[PDB]
């Protein structure tokens, strides 16, 4: 990744440049009951901190979004266990931070960009006369737990609980001789209990984050320590968003209230090897986890909107196996500026898998990469 600004895909320039931006925050009280409108067409599982673009065509969602503009700009995204019967027990709250209306083709179109804020539980699925669903919502809490040694630590050792800063920045391998010192000094009060030091390390947020960072840097070598968030909750949400997993695993990760449990589950998910295969055939391999790399500031998987308002969750990979290419390169409505695209379908079952992006110039790096949609991929765990 050289001479390509990874900040470009995050701003979503293809949608527009003169969007109306609202700065603010509206956080609901914990364990509170609320009524929030539901978008009828979205079928995506939004993790807090993720960005969602939307194009709205029908008059009723236009009017509902217009009403939402001054009423706290909050709508609910429902995580459908099975999308056919529209039954959901959990969901997420999305806040609007960019919006704009157009009058092209003689009809009104509203473009919206939203970010996930909070999790909730579905109580009552009320339906209105105008086709917009109103949901009874209970706001789930974020559990912040103190250090495991806060209940046992000696007071005389409280001054030694603060460590000198992590040694001179390493770039690869990360020889520690420090994580050992950190384990020895932070959990020194472990001999006052029935459990050893490494068990308490298995429930430490910093160590889990370091392990996750090492495993992520194994696959993509261009990660920097400051690219990931320094807060356990934000880090866990970002990692859950970036993992190539199916819907049930994402729902299970969303059901967890504690960041430490989420980090442990994410490590367990990463440990088991996965290979991405075509969903229709289930017998042809498309790509492996080793070729997953991050061309965007928000990981190798993001949500984008096509010219007709349909949302694809695209995964950026280096090498794609067994994909047929049909069409000519075209730069219209490309989610990655400076790249064209050609549609790619499975060589066997001819189902739509994704696209192939080819750079227009010759000084761009990477010259070519493939973007595959999540809904056409299934994780194969041997």
């Amino acid at each position: 990744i050289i001479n390509f600004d990874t900040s470009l895909p995050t701003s979503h320039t293809y949608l527009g440049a003169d969007m109306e931006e609202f700065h603010g925050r509206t956080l609901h009280d914990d364990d509170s009951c609320q009524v929030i409108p539901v978008l009828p067409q979205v079928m995506m599982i939004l993790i807090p901190g993720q960005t969602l673009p939307l194009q709205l065509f029908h008059p009723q969602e236009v009017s509902m979004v217009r009403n939402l503009i001054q009423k706290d700009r909050t709508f609910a995204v429902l995580a459908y266990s099975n999308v056919q019967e529209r039954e959901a027990q959990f969901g997420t709250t999305a806040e609007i931070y960019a919006y704009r209306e157009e009058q092209d083709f003689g009809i009104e179109i509203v473009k919206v960009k939203a970010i996930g804020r909070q999790r909730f539980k579905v109580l009552e699925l009320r339906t209105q006369s105008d086709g917009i669903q109103q949901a009874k919502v209970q706001i789930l809490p974020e559990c912040v737990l103190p250090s495991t040694m806060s209940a046992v630590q000696l007071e005389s050792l409280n001054k030694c609980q603060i460590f000198p800063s992590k040694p001179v920045s390493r770039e690869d391998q990360c020889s520690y001789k420090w994580w050992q010192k950190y384990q020895k000094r932070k959990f020194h009060c472990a001999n006052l209990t029935s459990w050893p030091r490494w068990l308490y390390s298995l429930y430490d947020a910093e160590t889990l984050m370091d392990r996750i960072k090492k495993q992520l840097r194994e696959w993509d070598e261009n990660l920097k320590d400051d690219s990931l968030p320094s807060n356990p909750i934000d880090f866990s949400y970002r990692v859950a968003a970036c993992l190539p997993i199916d819907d049930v695993l994402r729902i299970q990760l969303l059901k967890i209230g504690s960041a430490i449990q989420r980090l442990r589950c994410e490590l367990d998910i990463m440990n088991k090897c996965t290979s991405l295969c075509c969903k229709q055939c289930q017998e042809t391999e498309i790509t492996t986890k080793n070729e997953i790399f991050s061309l965007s500031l928000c990981g190798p998987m993001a949500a984008y909107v096509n010219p007709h308002g349909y949302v694809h969750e695209t995964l950026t990979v280096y090498k794609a196996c067994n994909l047929n290419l049909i069409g000519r390169p075209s730069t219209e409505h490309s989610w990655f500026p400076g790249y064209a695209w050609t549609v790619a379908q499975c060589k066997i079952c001819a189902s739509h898998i994704g696209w192939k992006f080819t750079a227009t110039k010759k000084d761009m790096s990477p010259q070519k990469f493939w973007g595959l949609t999540r809904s056409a991929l299934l994780p194969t765990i041997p």
């Binding site: 096509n306 007709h308 349909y310 049909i326 075209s330 695209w341 050609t342 549609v343 001819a350 739509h352």
Partner: peptide, 26 residues
């Protein structure tokens, strides 16, 4: 001109349009 809605431009042929149409549903 003629092209898909669940995917990118597919205007190679009139046949390709409806091929992609029943393909996308399946």
């Amino acid at each position: 001109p003629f092209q898909c809605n669940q995917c990118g431009a597919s205007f190679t042929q009139k046949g390709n349009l409806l091929r992609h149409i029943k393909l996308h549903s399946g």
